[PDB]
């Protein structure tokens, strides 16, 4: 499975990005670190497109697709 | 966070334009212009001065995205922030907005308090 790792999030961003990714897809194993958000990713959107929208709040390299 | 940022409230509907206006008000924003469409806006934009397109997704002659792609294949307007105002938070809109190059999105009607938060993040990402 591809895991999306959103590294480096802000105060209230955890809650909010949690809230935003929550608009595009569904996050599980929501590790709400003080500043991070990892969650496993479904694969429901072309890597090339998830990239594109998170990209409304965050950037291409903050995004890693690992297994 | 310029309480004077020039909002091209592109929408073809007056009262909304008016509460958007009044909420911008109770929140402190008072500089709002109104446009009725994409050719009008493109014509209007072919002019310039616009900083924030609070563009409603839909309008006649040329809509929000053609507005946005033409905006993008054209040398001069290729990078304007377009806050697509959407009546609802939907993915493809959100993505097409993304692949053709849009800046962000918001859902009406919002309280003064909510409009307050969305503006903040675009501002954030674009570096404003």
Q: Domain limits of chain B?
A: 1-128
Asked if B122 contacts B105 with a C-beta cutoff of 8 angstroms, the reply is no
Distance of CA A9 to the CA centre of its chain: 10
Angstrom distance (rounded) from CA B83 to CA A43:
27
What Å resolution does this PDB entry report?
2.0
Domain B1-128: CATH architecture, name and number where available: 3-Layer(aba) Sandwich (3.40)
**Distance from the B99 Cα atom to the nearest Cα atom in chain A, whole angstroms:** 7
Residues 6+ apart with CB under 8 A from A35: A8, A9, A10, A14
The DSSP annotation for chain B comes to --TT--EEEE-S-HHHHHHHHHHHHHTT---EEEE--HHHHHHHHHH----EEEEES--SSS-HHHHHHHHHHSTTTTT--EEEEESS--HHHHHHHHHTT--EEEESS--HHHHHHHHHHHHHHHT-
Phi, psi at B48, each rounded to 5°? 135, -170
Q: Which of A53, A58, A60, A62 to mutate to test the interface with B (most CBs of B within 10 A)?
A: A53
Provide the token pair at B74.
Answer: 């054209």
Angstrom distance (rounded) from CA B107 to CA B53:
15
CA-to-CA separations, B114 to B9, B59, B101, in angstroms, rounded: 17, 25, 24
Residues 6+ apart with CB under 8 A from B110: B23, B118
Phi, psi at B115, each rounded to 5°? -50, -40
Residue A63: exposure state from Cβ atoms within 10 A (0-12, 13-18, ≥19): middle
CA-to-CA separations, B111 to A8, A52, B117, B121, in angstroms, rounded: 30, 29, 10, 17
Angstrom distance (rounded) from CA B45 to CA A24:
31
CA atoms within 13 A on the CB side of B7: 24
Contacts of A53 in chain B (CB under 8 A): 91, 94-95, 98
Asked if B16 contacts B24 with a C-beta cutoff of 8 angstroms, the reply is no
Radius of gyration of chain B (CA): 13
Long-range contacts of B19-22 (CB under 8 A, 24+ apart): B19/B109, B20/B54, B20/B108, B20/B115
Asked if A46 contacts B88 with a C-beta cutoff of 8 angstroms, the reply is no
What CATH number has the domain spanning A1-67?
A: 3.30.70.400
Angstrom distance (rounded) from CA A31 to CA B52:
35
A–B CB contacts, 8 A cutoff, strictly below:
30
Place of tokens 């809509």: B63
Using CB atoms, which residue from A16, A23, A56 is nearest to B125?
A56
Phi, psi at A63, each rounded to 5°? -110, 120
**Distance from the A57 Cα atom to the nearest Cα atom in chain B, whole angstroms:** 6
CA-to-CA separations, B75 to B46, B89, B95, in angstroms, rounded: 12, 30, 23
Q: CB distance B125–A45 less than 8 Å?
A: no
Method: X-ray
Provide the token pair at B127.
Answer: 């570096």
Contacts of A23 in chain B (CB under 8 A): 89, 91, 94
Using CB atoms, which residue from B91, B95, B121 is nearest to A57?
B121
């Amino acid at each position: 499975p591809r895991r999306i790792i959103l590294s480096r999030l802000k105060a209230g961003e955890v809650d909010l990005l949690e809230e935003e990714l929550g608009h595009l897809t569904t996050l599980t194993d929501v590790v709400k670190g003080a500043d991070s958000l990892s969650a496993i990713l479904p694969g429901d959107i072309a890597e090339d497109d998830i990239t594109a929208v998170l990209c409304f709040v965050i950037e291409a390299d903050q995004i890693t697709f690992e297994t | 966070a310029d309480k004077e940022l020039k909002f091209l409230v592109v929408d073809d509907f007056s009262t909304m334009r008016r509460i958007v206006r009044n909420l911008l008000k109770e929140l402190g924003f008072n500089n709002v212009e109104e446009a009725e469409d994409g050719v009008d806006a493109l014509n209007k934009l072919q002019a310039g001065g616009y900083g924030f397109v609070i563009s409603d997704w839909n309008m006649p002659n040329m809509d929000g995205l053609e507005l946005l792609k033409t905006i993008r294949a054209d040398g001069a307007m290729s990078a304007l922030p377009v806050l697509m105002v959407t009546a609802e938070a939907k993915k493809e809109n959100i993505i097409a907005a993304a692949q053709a190059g849009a800046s962000g999105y918001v859902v009406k009607p919002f309280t003064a308090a909510t409009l307050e938060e969305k503006l903040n993040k675009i501002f954030e990402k674009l570096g404003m």
